[PDB]
């Protein structure tokens, strides 16, 4: 029951980030300004490629 | 970055609206061309039939 807890509050919190996004006219892409350290930007990357 | 975002737009516009205009068009005209075609060839098979006829007569 407690892992269940947590899937269920971390896909409202992804529900949540979902809702800020940009409401394109056409664009199935979307296309998100983020406030993000400098210092990781090497790791951000590796991960978005993950 | 701001300038291939409406480029999209518009040549998904275009597209839809000239193929289904094209498509409608086709469409009503291929009506009649192909009433026109099919009548043309049954009266010619009438032709044929009229021959056949005769000969059997």
Redesign the interface.
Known sequence: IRVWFIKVRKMKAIYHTLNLCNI????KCLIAEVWCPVTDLDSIQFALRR | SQTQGIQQLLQAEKRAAEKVADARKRKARRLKQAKEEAQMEVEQYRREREQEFQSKQ
């Open positions: 394109d006219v056409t664009q």
